Amino acid sequence: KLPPGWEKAMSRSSGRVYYFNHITNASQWERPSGEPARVRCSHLLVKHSQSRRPSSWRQEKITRTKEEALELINGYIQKIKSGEEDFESLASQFSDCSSAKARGDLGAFSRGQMQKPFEDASFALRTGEMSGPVFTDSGIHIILRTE
Numbered sequence: 779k780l781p782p783g784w785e786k787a788m789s790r791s792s793g794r795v796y797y798f799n800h801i802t803n804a805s806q807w808e809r810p811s812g813e814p815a816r817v818r819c820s821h822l823l824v825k826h827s828q829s830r831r832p833s834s835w836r837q838e839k840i841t842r843t844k845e846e847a848l849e850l851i852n853g854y855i856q857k858i859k860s861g862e863e864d865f866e867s868l869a870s871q872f873s874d875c876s877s878a879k880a881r882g883d884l885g886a887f888s889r890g891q892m893q894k895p896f897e898d899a900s901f902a903l904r905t906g907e908m909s910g911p912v913f914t915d916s917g918i919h920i921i922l923r924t925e
């Protein structure tokens with residue numbers, strides 16, 4: 779009865795069941811809440827040395843490895859989930875995208891405009907829901923669906 783995209787999983791450290799979405803890479807303890815022409819999303823991008831364009835407003839030459847970029851993404855997700863930091867604040871400070879200046883907001887879009895892994899995650903998110911690490915040719919993203 780699980781919605782499409784979701785599967786049951788088992789915590790290795792605790793043995794508690796949880797749920798994982800293989801389109802958004804989201805994970806949560808609770809059983810998921812069982813298509814819009816357009817969605818609106820914000821994102822936080824962390825680029826790496828294999829990014830299509832290894833440059834951003836933060837850094838002329840982006841040299842961190844993909845594994846280092848994933849570790850940074852994972853740390854931002856932990857702080858957002860703990861409430862220690864707000865998504866909008868981390869995006870303004872640390873996103874390797876020009877949309878950092880707008881708290882990560884990309885505005886609204888339909889299918890056919892974004893890179894495919896980003897588009898698929900954006901449209902599989904519920905309104906208000908955050909993705910896990912999403913990989914594109916630009917880098918690694920945290921995606922927040924706002925509308």
Ligand SMILES: Nc1ccc(CC(=O)O)cc1
Nearest residue numbers: 875876892893896897916
């Ligand atoms: N700067 C930047 C990089 C990647 C994306 C997502 C996509 O292209 O699908 C959006 C903005």
Ligand SMILES: [Cl-]
Nearest residue numbers: 903904905906
């Ligand atoms: Cl929704």
